[PDB]
Every structure is written in C-alpha cells, then in structure tokens.
Amino acid sequence: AFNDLLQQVGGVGRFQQIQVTLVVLPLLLMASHNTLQNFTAAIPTHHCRPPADAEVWLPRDRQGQPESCLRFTSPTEPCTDGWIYDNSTFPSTIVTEWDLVCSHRALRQLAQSLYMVGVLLGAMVFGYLADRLGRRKVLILNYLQTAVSGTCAAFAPNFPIYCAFRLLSGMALAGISLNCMTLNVEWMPIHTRACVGTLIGYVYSLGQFLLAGVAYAVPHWRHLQLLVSAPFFAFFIYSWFFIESARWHSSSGRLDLTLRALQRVARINGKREEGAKLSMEVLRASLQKEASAMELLRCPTLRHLFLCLSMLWFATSFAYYGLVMDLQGFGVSIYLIQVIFGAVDLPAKLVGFLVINSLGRRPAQMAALLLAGICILLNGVIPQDQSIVRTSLAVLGKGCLAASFNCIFLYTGELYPTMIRQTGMGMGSTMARVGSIVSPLVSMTAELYPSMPLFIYGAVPVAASAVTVLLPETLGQPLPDTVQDLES
C-alpha cells in the first residue's frame, strides 16, 4: 500500500516537479555523446604529399580525381611521407591528427566499437552496484566519472589513451541511463508510470538538434569534445541535494530512514499535519506485506519465447546503429542531414501509437521491420549519382526503425509473465547492445566491396521480420500470470 502513502504525502508535488526535471535534464547530452563520431571523426578529401623537389605527380583516375595511395615513384609507391588534407569544411578531426587513412581505415571503427564495448559493462556493473549502495550514491559517481574521463580525452596525445577514455565515458553513461529512470519512477504514483516513460524518449531525441547546432558552432574536435563533456561538472555539483528513494530503504529493511524521508517530503510539499501524523507503527502496519536468470533455460516455454525476442532486439539495434552513422555520401552537408534524421522521429511515433492499437503488435512490428529492411537494402543498388531520392529512403528507414523500437518495448513487456518480467526486459535490452557492438565491426569490410556493408544492414532486418510469425498475439488480453496459464 506504498502508493497510498505516496498519495497521502501529496502525490505529485513541488518535490517531484523539481527532482524529476533535475534528473531528466542531463539526458540532453546522451544523443551527443553517442553519435559524436560523425563530427569529431569525419574524413576529408586527401592526397599524397609530393616531395619538395620542384602538380602532375599523382596517378589520378576515375574522372581525374587524384589517387590516395601512390605517388609516381619516378617523374606506384606507398606514400611514407604524410598526406595533405583539405581544410575547407573540416579544419581538424581525429583522422587528421593520427593519419588514419588508406592503411589504418579500421581504426575509426575500432574506436566506435570500443566506446560501445564499454556500455555493456557499464549497464552491468553500475546496475549491480545501484541496488546495493543507493540510486543517488551511484548517480553522483557517474556524473563525476563521465566528466573526469570525458574532458581528459580531449587532451590525449595518443590513440590508445583516447580509446580508453572514451571507453570510460561510455561506462559512466551506461549507468546514468539506468539510474535516471530507476530513481525517477519510484517517487511517482502508480497511475503515472507511463507518462514518465514517454518523457525519457521525448527528451532523448532532442539531443540531436543540440548536436547539429553545437558541432556546427564549434568545428574543431578537441573543443567539441570538451564543450560536450564539460557540463557534467555542473550536473555533479548539485547532485548532492537529491533525496534517496524511500522504497529502496523499505526493501533493504531500515524503516526509520523511510520515515525520515517521508517526513521531509511532506515538509517540502506543505502537508506537515499528515507528516507528523505518520508514525513508526503506521508504516509497520501499512507496508507489512514486504526469478532466477537461469530459469529462462531448462524450460522450453520460456526459452522458445526468449530466443525470438532476443533476435528482434538484436536486429533492430544492429540496423539502427548501422544506419545512423556514415552521414557522408548523400550529397548534402551533415549539418542538414542530422537535423532531418532527428526531426523525423515525431511522425514515426504518432503512427506507431496509431497502428499498433488498430491492428495489433505482430502486424505493426513485422511491417515496420520489413519496410525498414527494404528501404535500407535499396540504397546499395541505386548509384551515388542520385541525391534527392537517396536520402528519402534513409529517413524512411530511420523512422521505421524508431517505430520498431517503440513497438518492441511494449510487446516484450506485455508478452512475458508477471514474475519474470523484470529480468526478462533486462536480458532483452542487453541483446540490443551486442548489436551496437557488432554494427561498426561489419562496416570494416567496405574495403572488399563498396556496398557489402549496406547489403548486410539490409538483409538482417528482413530475415528478422519473419520471426514474428511464431509469437502469440497479445492485443486486448489479460497479462499472463504464471508459466502455467501462459497458453495463448
């Protein structure tokens, strides 16, 4: 009956209207910190450096554009003398610093994959150490780490240092992302748990506008990294005034701390009379009523349901974080493609919340996944000459993939039983990060063919859009209680 207590103290009061916004404000920067290897690691046009023994020194081909690997040995040799990058649009990036061109093309992908290898470990470690130390105690440490290892990478003199510090930044953000929602949904009432679940996805897709603005205001990569990883100091200085969630104190056993927190919340809300009316016996008599991750195995009815959902999660995340990168090659500047990839997410949700309720979950999911797969696969056929009909397919695929996220999140929840639903969505979201790890590794093979990555990104969602023909429909039904009554 804890919700009745929360309603007694005031329900949704000024305390919530302050702490909720102060905790959800630091998610305007996660979009910037995720898709940064588009403005901080761009690749400008480059050609070999002629020896200062003096124009006609480069074996140009393919419509006259100079080669990028040979230098006419005598007036067909590897460069070994540094390159001469252009400085008209990208004055400085990572690839300009450490010469990641024509022999070390895999290093950008290695950095982007090492940033995402340190989001899995983050979501694991800072999720295990959150319900054992405190939500606020972990928020403070993460707000600190994501700025003591995110501005010390903007001053790195080597490549491995940059890689390791980006890994640590990802490790911190992967704990901020969990603890935000976990702490935020515990001080709200029970009837407003879905109005705060669609606010961490409505302010999440506003970081892309901020990125398209900032990265255009500040082109250099060191200044950009520093200016994007600086405000976490301000977000950390005031991170001591947060109030710990009373439900965690209640679960841990210590009830006097819960009573103190509730009295403080009552004083803040302006209900001192009912706050002092609260006592120890009242709480002891009102809250006296108060799942293995391996049980998914050795149980066919659960394993058969887990495999399909894992495949759907993986395919969606893989296609998404394979498409949202490589904004170069559409004939239009990146500062205009970002503000179009981030402004097509409103219709992709207004239609997702209009097709699932009218037909179901299976048809909407399958349609979104297959249409995104086709729109992705069709770009690896049309030649790069077209530039008006080659970005529309990209924006359509991105919208369809966002709709796929928003539908699979609800479907996985409504599908599982009620006791294992907490550790089912966890194992389902974990498989949405192995996808983001293996997504940039595939883009390395673009050396073997100029379109094989685009073909790989197009076939996995299509091969996954045929898995939903094995899952039960769950529109207009009661949520299944146990594994026994889960039949149809």
Closest CB to ligand L8P among 283 and 432?
432
Query: Residue 245 in contact with residue 183, Cβ under 8 Å?
Result: yes
Q: How far is the CB of 26 from ligand L8P (least distance, A)?
A: 16
Q: Report in angstroms how near the CB of residue 261 gets to ligand L8P at its nearest.
A: 30
Question: Closer to ligand L8P at the Cβ: 306 or 405?
Answer: 405
Question: Shortest CA distance to 140 belongs to which of 240, 233, 213, 218?
Answer: 240
Q: Which positions lie near ligand L8P, rule CB under 6 A?
A: 201, 204-205, 345, 349, 402, 405-406
Between residues 95 and 348, which has the closer beta carbon with respect to ligand L8P? Answer: 348
Cβ-based nearer residue to ligand L8P, 204 or 216: 204
Give least dist CB 83 to ligand L8P, A: 35
Smallest gap, in angstroms, from Cβ of residue 342 to ligand L8P? 8
CA gap 73, 68 in Å, rounded = 14
CB of 419 to ligand L8P, least distance (A): 23
Between 204 and 335, name the residue whose CB sits nearer to ligand L8P: 204
Rounded to the nearest whole angstrom, what is the least distance from the CB of residue 470 to ligand L8P in the complex? 24
Gap between the Cα atoms of 475 and 488, Å rounded? 11
Q: Which is nearer to ligand L8P, 349 or 390 (CB)?
A: 349
Dihedral (CA of 106, 107, 109, 113) sign: positive
Of 69 and 200, CB closest to ligand L8P: 200
Which residues, 6 or more positions from 403, have their beta carbon under 8 angstroms from its beta carbon? 348, 349, 351, 352, 364, 368
* Minimal distance, residue 29 CB to ligand L8P, in Å: 14
User: Which residues lie closer than 8 Å to 250 by C-beta, 6 or more apart?
Assistant: 2, 258, 287, 290
What is the spatial distance between Cα 414 and Cα 402, in angstroms, rounded to a whole number?
Answer: 19
Contacts 24+ apart (CB under 8 A), 80-85: 81/48, 81/49, 81/51, 82/49, 83/46, 83/47, 83/48, 83/49, 84/46, 84/47, 84/48, 84/49, 85/44, 85/45, 85/46
The DSSP symbol for 38 reads: T
Look up residue 66 and give its DSSP letter: P
